[PDB]
Design a binder for this molecule. Sequence first.
Ligand code: BCL
Ligand code: BCL
Ligand code: BCL
Ligand SMILES: CC[C@H]1c2cc3[nH]c4c(c3C)C(=O)[C@H](C(=O)OC)c4c3nc(cc4[nH]c(cc(n2)[C@@H]1C)c(C(C)=O)c4C)[C@@H](C)[C@@H]3CCC(=O)OC/C=C(/C)CCC[C@H](C)CCC[C@H](C)CCCC(C)C
Ligand SMILES: CC[C@H]1c2cc3[nH]c4c(c3C)C(=O)[C@H](C(=O)OC)c4c3nc(cc4[nH]c(cc(n2)[C@@H]1C)c(C(C)=O)c4C)[C@@H](C)[C@@H]3CCC(=O)OC/C=C(\C)CCC[C@H](C)CCC[C@H](C)CCCC(C)C
Ligand SMILES: CC(C)=CCC/C(C)=C\CC/C(C)=C/CC/C(C)=C/CC/C(C)=C/CC/C(C)=C/CC/C(C)=C\CC/C(C)=C/CC1=C(C)C(=O)c2ccccc2C1=O
Ligand SMILES: COC(C)(C)C/C=C/C(C)=C/C=C/C(C)=C/C=C/C(C)=C/C=C\C=C(C)\C=C\C=C(C)\C=C\C=C(C)\C=C\CC(C)(C)OC
Ligand code: HEC
Ligand code: HEC
Ligand code: HEC
Ligand SMILES: CCCCCCCCCCCCCCCCCC
Ligand SMILES: CCCCCCCCCCCCCCCCCC
Ligand SMILES: CCCCCCCCCCCCCCCCCC
Ligand SMILES: [Fe+3]
Ligand SMILES: [Mg+2]
Ligand SMILES: [Mg+2]
Ligand SMILES: [Mg+2]
Ligand SMILES: [Mg+2]
Lengths: 342, 53, 53, 53, 287, 273, 49, 49, 245
Amino acid sequence: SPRAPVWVGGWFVVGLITIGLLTVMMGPAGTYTQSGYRGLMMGEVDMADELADDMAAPKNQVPAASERFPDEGPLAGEVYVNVPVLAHLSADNFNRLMVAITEWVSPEEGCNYCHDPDDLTAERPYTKIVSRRMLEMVMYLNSQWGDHVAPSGVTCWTCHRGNPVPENIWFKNDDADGGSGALGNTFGQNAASWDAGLSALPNDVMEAYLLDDQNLRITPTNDLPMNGVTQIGTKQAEWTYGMMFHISKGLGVNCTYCHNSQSFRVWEMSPPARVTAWHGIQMTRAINVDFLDPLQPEYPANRLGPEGDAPKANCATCHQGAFKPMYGENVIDDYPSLAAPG
Amino acid sequence: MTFSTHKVWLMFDPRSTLVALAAFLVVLALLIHFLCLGHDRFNWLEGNPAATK
Amino acid sequence: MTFSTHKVWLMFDPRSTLVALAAFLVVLALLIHFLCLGHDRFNWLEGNPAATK
Amino acid sequence: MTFSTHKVWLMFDPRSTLVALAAFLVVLALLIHFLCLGHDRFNWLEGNPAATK
Amino acid sequence: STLSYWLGKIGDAQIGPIYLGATGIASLIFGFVAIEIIGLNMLASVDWNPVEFLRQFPWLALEPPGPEHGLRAMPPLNEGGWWVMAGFFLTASILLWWVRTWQRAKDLGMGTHIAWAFASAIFFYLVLGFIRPVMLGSWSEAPPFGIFPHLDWTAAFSIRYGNLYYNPFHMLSIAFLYGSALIFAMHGATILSVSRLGGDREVEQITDRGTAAERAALFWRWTMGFNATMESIHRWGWWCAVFVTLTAGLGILLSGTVVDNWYLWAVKHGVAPTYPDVFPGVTDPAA
Amino acid sequence: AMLSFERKYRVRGGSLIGGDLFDFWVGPFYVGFFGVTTLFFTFVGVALIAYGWVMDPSDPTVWQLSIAPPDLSYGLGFAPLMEGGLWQIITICAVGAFVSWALREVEICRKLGIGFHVPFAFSFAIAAYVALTVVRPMLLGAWGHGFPYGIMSHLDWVSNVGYQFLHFHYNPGHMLGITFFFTTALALAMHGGLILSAANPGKGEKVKGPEHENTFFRDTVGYSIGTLGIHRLGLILALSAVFWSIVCMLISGPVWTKGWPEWWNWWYELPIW
Amino acid sequence: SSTGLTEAEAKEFHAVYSQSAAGFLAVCAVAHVLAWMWRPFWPGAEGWV
Amino acid sequence: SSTGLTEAEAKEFHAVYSQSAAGFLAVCAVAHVLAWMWRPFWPGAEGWV
Amino acid sequence: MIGDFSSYMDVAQIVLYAFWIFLFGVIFYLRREDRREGYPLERDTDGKIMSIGPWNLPAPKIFYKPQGGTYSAPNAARDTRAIKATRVGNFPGAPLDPTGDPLVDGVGPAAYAERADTPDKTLEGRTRIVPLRTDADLWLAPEDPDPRGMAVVAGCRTTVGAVSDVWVDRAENIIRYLEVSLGKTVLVPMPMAVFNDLTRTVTVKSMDAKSFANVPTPKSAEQITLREEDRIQAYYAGGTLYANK
Ligand code: BCL
Ligand code: BCL
Ligand code: BCL
Ligand SMILES: CC[C@H]1c2cc3[nH]c4c(c3C)C(=O)[C@H](C(=O)OC)c4c3nc(cc4[nH]c(cc(n2)[C@@H]1C)c(C(C)=O)c4C)[C@@H](C)[C@@H]3CCC(=O)OC/C=C(/C)CCC[C@H](C)CCC[C@H](C)CCCC(C)C
Ligand SMILES: CC[C@H]1c2cc3[nH]c4c(c3C)C(=O)[C@H](C(=O)OC)c4c3nc(cc4[nH]c(cc(n2)[C@@H]1C)c(C(C)=O)c4C)[C@@H](C)[C@@H]3CCC(=O)OC/C=C(\C)CCC[C@H](C)CCC[C@H](C)CCCC(C)C
Ligand SMILES: CC(C)=CCC/C(C)=C\CC/C(C)=C/CC/C(C)=C/CC/C(C)=C/CC/C(C)=C/CC/C(C)=C\CC/C(C)=C/CC1=C(C)C(=O)c2ccccc2C1=O
Ligand SMILES: COC(C)(C)C/C=C/C(C)=C/C=C/C(C)=C/C=C/C(C)=C/C=C\C=C(C)\C=C\C=C(C)\C=C\C=C(C)\C=C\CC(C)(C)OC
Ligand code: HEC
Ligand code: HEC
Ligand code: HEC
Ligand SMILES: CCCCCCCCCCCCCCCCCC
Ligand SMILES: CCCCCCCCCCCCCCCCCC
Ligand SMILES: CCCCCCCCCCCCCCCCCC
Ligand SMILES: [Fe+3]
Ligand SMILES: [Mg+2]
Ligand SMILES: [Mg+2]
Ligand SMILES: [Mg+2]
Ligand SMILES: [Mg+2]
């Protein structure tokens, strides 16, 4: 059969209509905000519809709080028996806090999730024991970690968001290691893991930084090597990078939110959000070391991890994909009881 | 181009033209289907409520 | 051109001119439909209220 | 190949066969030596205790 | 010696025959051992499942030893020993292939220019995998054998040594890669434009200058004021391609050995731009 | 008539505006209407870059010189001359100068009676520059999306734009462009070496012809691209590299607004598995 | 003419192509009527309310 | 002349082209009237209120 | 410190400057190789040879040609053929105007180089470009249309003849020229021809009917020299500027 010469103009029109196909197919274009200097391109790249949907998500709507009773009446420590951490609240405020906590942690299961159905005084369920340490942790976070959580504060809704198990929790060997026998060592990486943003980066970094105090500072403070300072660290850089993937995914931001890529090391070129993130790293490590990990004996086997360790919190446990938890909604002003230990 | 314009094929060779026309029509169909899929009211697979505000 | 100026095709090739005109018309139609789709009032698929302030 | 199959060299060129065999044997020897070095009990230069568990 | 219609449209249609020779067979044996090691470690990393292998192949790799092993000659197998073996066998196969290319040039009576252009790439590959880890005393500074993992290694190497954009030899290597693309587009377009005059037969134009070579020279002389000859443009391209990997090896040698932070190196030498302080009161909270 | 064979080629013709006024040479360079416009735009742009250099309060070196685009708040509008307007005017002049260079190359090709492959290939670099400074900024709604005009600051722009997606290496168009750029250097090295080996066979050897050239690659890789196919292959490789660079930058921001590694969830969670 | 196709073969081809295009447009009109009966696609003043 | 037509082919092509362009413009005008009845194009002093 | 020579200087800076020296030397060497053809330069007004330093012009290198002979570059040979073109006033850079027919004279885009007056050979010493009617070991791929028999149309939409044969490169298996019998036989370079297999025509837009009648012809009908090839190709290339206008 004769070969037909290619219709250049017709295929050019087809190319134009395919460009239209691409435009309708793959974007109304993302919305930009500029945080740094011009020409640097430090800022946020967000789809407007997706950002609006995440703000209008049910988890980002802090439940309405009832009017607070005047703190002048019979305390909860005399009316009730087993209230070691809430013995300074007026009984009316104690009941208001119980209702709020039920709305925040177990709205579906109701008051019976953390209480014996026929005895509110009995510390039978493990959930009551865990909730007491939850209350203590929230008070500790509000009183002692205002460098990070103020002025918004943290309540039971900040992590739990209306269900007993918070959405973003982690364990020690959260990503199953690969390799059979003497072959296939994945080295805690080389997998399509969502902890590393679906990259082949170290996906089990939360243990080194949010439970351990390992160094995230890989970049030297001098241009030339020192005699006692290490001259290597490319693989150690991958651990920091994976941790920064976790941080970026937990806040729904990019690297430029806290860094100038010209030098990831220089704080003077960094947005003031990097200072809040430093306090956040310290606070998350404190949370895991002091409250969430020592709760392992109180958990059933259904709640533990592959390594038998307690569930732990990270940047994404509170923020849930936003730069601030619930995008900055104040949650502690309505509940002064959760703002400081008694 | 009407039913009586039969000599258009003396200018546009059908063998080198219909393949491009078919490609154009297929791409247009894909474009419109994806345009309908990109809106909440006409994404028939997602099945959102008709009244979308 | 005009209904009477038929000698333009002694100067402009009747086929390359039609191809260029079709390309221009397709591009213009896509551009104007995209401009209508990019505004709240005239996006007929989003169906915002006509009174859009 | 046996002690009595001397006619193999009428079918296989001795020079290329010997060079390919030398290459294969060197690669095999290196691979096995490296596999021994890659295990605790058989790295003779690292000198771990034989009882390795 | 089969034919190929589709390849005969862009160029020639004949595929083969290929001459391997002694060094070719040796290189194939070494390289197959290396590839078997790498691929079997990748398949074992998904617990031998080929469904998961297909899912995760870009993410899979053979990983170098950790920093805890240093430059141990042969680490434990599943702790980087497989990587060291795969690197050794790949290096041996690549070196034997270089010898093969040199020998193929010699037996055809041709010059050994492709061999010495391959030597530059081999130098860069050796700096990446063997030479620099030896000087730094750590196998861990070497790239993994994986698709997404060596991109992760690339990014983490740039991050570890302070924005490799500020490495002057990285700048030179990027200039030479851009120039390789520039020169090769220039030369392809020039030869295609004078193909109506016999310009694709360049070696015949070298020993007997025709109007194709003259017009190719004059186009560039009238465009940018200077030109090359039909043979000199190939030296230009050869050197531009060689300098890519030469400067790449040179800039990787200097990272961690003599320079540990490249952005601070540029700050010392007045190279890094200074931007107005948009964030006036941000300091190190750990200071 | 500078080269020993140039006199017979210096004739009238090739103008794209139909006129003999600009048809002349100044030294080796051919001057056209588009040569004049190229020099006009070039001197304007260089003088404005020097102005922005001397007006910089930080006293930058040649490396630290930077003329930055306007803020993203100015949108697709007009900025003060010291607040992005200088970058805008230099961008307009650069686009004009590059288009004029391509059109002058078209004029030179028409005068020499050769194909327009070189202006066409340079149009790809011009399209990359335009997609970086004009098209992508309009797609994103602000001229502040273009890169600053500085030797070292445009590297910082590249770095921060890449880290806006947390791992730019995972961009598929970026992967394709890098593959094509590295393959272009590989092919250029192979071609230059083959031509140099054929033209310089050594001592006691005659200059090798097309048979030896084809035999070397059929004996090494197993396929010979030919002498015409190698130049088509090289032009195609460079043009594909630049085209995929344009695609990868046009899908970053206008299309993809999240991390690039998670785009591969289409393959990791393909409906098959 | 410039195609080399006979003026009668072109007439036959245009007849068949015209029938094909008319059938295609009839199917498209039916599909558009069905899609309007599913969900009308021209909003009123109140919008999709 | 410059294209190769003979003022008769040009006259016939212009006849069919004039009819096609007039029909396309009439369809465009009808579509514009319909789109104006849907939602008017040009704002008032107070805008779209 | 590790890689420092002083408080400012360091090893990387010195290696960078050493590479700067090496790169500048390589560029100098490359520019020397660029001057193996066309140098020394000459003036645009009287043809006086300009003096170039021996450090810019390399010593001549000898090419031992595959079929015998030695070409040197530079070779002290200068193209001094009389150009049939004039200009008003010998101003530097003033372009020339052909006196007569620029296509037949070889002026500008029709200019050609005085190459070897012997046909190009292969490795075994047999003519590289030959018509297909002479060689039986070479045929045309059945997947591609056969140019032979196709009508030949010039740039003025005139059928000037038909393709009678194809000249094939025996060293690359590629069609180099089309032998066209004018309705007396000419060679059309294939890159200058566009094929239409549906209408069975070959369009050469670079030629008119007048230009086809003046195309240079080889001395032999089965043999073409490098100079004849060069002249014919230059004629068709100059037709892009001098034929349809
Ligand atoms: C549509 C049917 C006829 C036609 C019939 C007429 C008639 C009648 C008139 C013109 C006139 C004009 N035509 Mg006409 N014209 C045709 C196709 C064209 C094409 C084309 C490439 O298709 C072009 C570029 C033009 C261009 C023009 C303008 C130069 C000129 C008036 C400009 C104008 O009104 O601005 C607005 C338009 C544009 C900016 C873009 C032009 C596109 C359309 C096709 C313009 C036609 C508008 C015309 C008024 C429609 C009247 C035809 C009715 C359907 C009966 N015509 C075809 C062949 N045309 C007028 C004139 O010459 O004044 C003395 C005039 O009276
Ligand atoms: C070493 C001295 C002789 C030789 C002496 C013998 C004798 C005797 C016998 C064989 C037999 C065999 N030989 Mg032999 N064989 C030789 C060289 C070779 C070479 C080679 C290219 O060098 C190869 C591939 C082989 C391969 C083989 C096998 C195909 C076959 C039995 C397989 C086997 O035992 O499993 C193991 C095989 C391998 C792991 C690969 C082969 C490697 C070695 C060289 C195989 C030798 C095995 C043989 C039993 C050792 C006997 C040598 C002693 C000095 C007697 N021989 C040389 C020339 N060979 C046996 C046979 O065919 O009986 C049915 C047998 O009885
Ligand atoms: C479908 C059967 C016939 C056909 C039958 C008719 C009839 C009858 C008429 C036209 C008319 C026109 N045709 Mg027609 N037309 C055909 C194929 C085509 C093709 C093509 C390459 O497929 C194109 C681009 C066109 C284009 C055109 C327009 C240029 C012109 C008036 C514009 C218009 O109505 O809407 C704008 C154009 C578009 C939106 C794109 C064009 C695509 C479709 C095919 C347009 C045809 C619509 C037609 C009116 C519907 C009748 C089909 C019935 C179901 C039988 N036709 C086939 C061969 N066509 C009208 C005319 O010339 O006015 C005086 C007219 O009365
Ligand atoms: C100037 C610098 C550029 C460059 C240069 C360069 N590279 C080169 C050359 C040159 C000039 C060569 O001569 C050489 C070559 O041959 O290229 C085609 C080579 C080469 N460049 C290569 C790749 C390469 N070059 C790269 C880059 C570049 N190379 C630079 C940009 C890169 C990148 C971007 O990372 C890569 C990946 C190779 C194609 C080749 C060297 C090949 C080699 O080393 O082979 C030995 C290694 C092996 C693993 C052997 C193969 C093992 C397989 C298992 C074979 C199959 C065996 C099986 C038995 C076959 C039969 C099966 C049966 C079922 C049929
Ligand atoms: C498309 C494939 C590759 C390509 C092709 C290509 N480029 C080409 C050609 C071709 C085929 C030419 O014919 C043409 C040429 O003549 O080359 C010698 C050209 C050319 N490629 C050039 C460079 C170049 N090509 C590049 C890339 C590429 N070119 C691609 C990889 C790059 C890169 C990647 O950075 C550069 C720098 C020039 C040497 C030349 C075009 C010369 C030109 O346009 O001259 C007219 C303009 C001036 C003399 C100066 C204008 C200055 C402005 C008025 C102000 C400055 C604006 C600028 C944006 C500032 C930048 C600051 C910082 C970002 C540094
Ligand atoms: C009205 C008025 C003001 C008049 C004044 C007129 C004046 C002053 C001048 C004329 C007008 C103009 C516009 C002049 C231009 C001025 C300028 C700015 C000139 C320089 C522009 C420019 C792009 C310069 C070169 C820049 C660089 C570094 C380019 C890269 C080149 C490179 C990497 C290597 C060089 C390799 C070479 C020489 C390649 C060319 C080359 C190629 C590519 C072949 O394939 C080929 C094949 C066969 C034979 C020869 C060749 C050959 O020479
Ligand atoms: C199951 O698998 C089958 C069997 C089907 C086979 C398939 C295999 C497959 C699919 C393999 C896929 C492999 C891939 C995708 C590999 C990708 C690799 C990439 C991208 C690598 C990138 C960079 C790597 C570099 C630069 C590595 C360099 C390493 C070097 C130079 C190491 C040198 C080491 C030496 C010289 C060691 C010497 C031995 C000593 C001297 C130490 O002994 C004491
Ligand atoms: C788990 C998230 C709980 C839910 C659901 C409810 N309560 Fe609670 N309750 C919880 C804790 C951790 C404590 C101890 C307080 C302390 O200071 O340690 C309590 C205690 C009470 C008591 C006191 C009983 C007693 O001491 O005798 C009462 C009366 C009480 N809570 C009431 C109550 C109501 C009404 C609830 C539904 C709105 C409810 N609880 C749910 C933890 C949790
Ligand atoms: C705010 C939520 C941040 C985001 C977004 C990113 N980073 Fe991070 N970075 C942040 C802090 C608080 C710190 C200091 C941690 C410490 O222990 O001091 C850092 C530090 C780094 C570093 C190392 C700096 C050094 O001195 O070596 C690197 C390499 C780094 N950050 C990289 C990085 C990347 C790649 C990011 C995008 C994925 C990113 N950061 C985002 C806070 C925040
Ligand atoms: C619950 C205890 C949290 C944990 C775990 C983490 N963060 Fe947080 N963060 C929390 C609150 C209540 C707020 C609001 C602060 C306010 O001013 O209202 C924040 C805020 C931040 C910010 C500031 C964002 C900004 O736009 O300024 C950053 C940068 C931040 N947090 C970082 C961060 C990181 C990196 C964390 C993991 C180590 C992390 N936070 C955990 C509450 C909680
Ligand atoms: C920015 C890097 C360096 C680029 C230099 C390119 C220079 C190209 C123009 C050369 C002009 C030469 C003019 C004189 C030629 C000889 C005249 C007798
Ligand atoms: C100059 C007055 C102060 C600033 C007013 C706002 C300027 C920016 C908004 C208007 C211009 C932006 C849109 C320009 C579109 C150009 C399309 C070619
Ligand atoms: C001060 C630094 C000087 C650097 C000079 C570099 C010169 C490089 C020359 C490379 C080519 C040599 C000749 C090769 C000819 C072909 C041999 C087969
Ligand atoms: Fe070449
Ligand atoms: Mg793990
Ligand atoms: Mg994990
Ligand atoms: Mg975001
Ligand atoms: Mg020292």
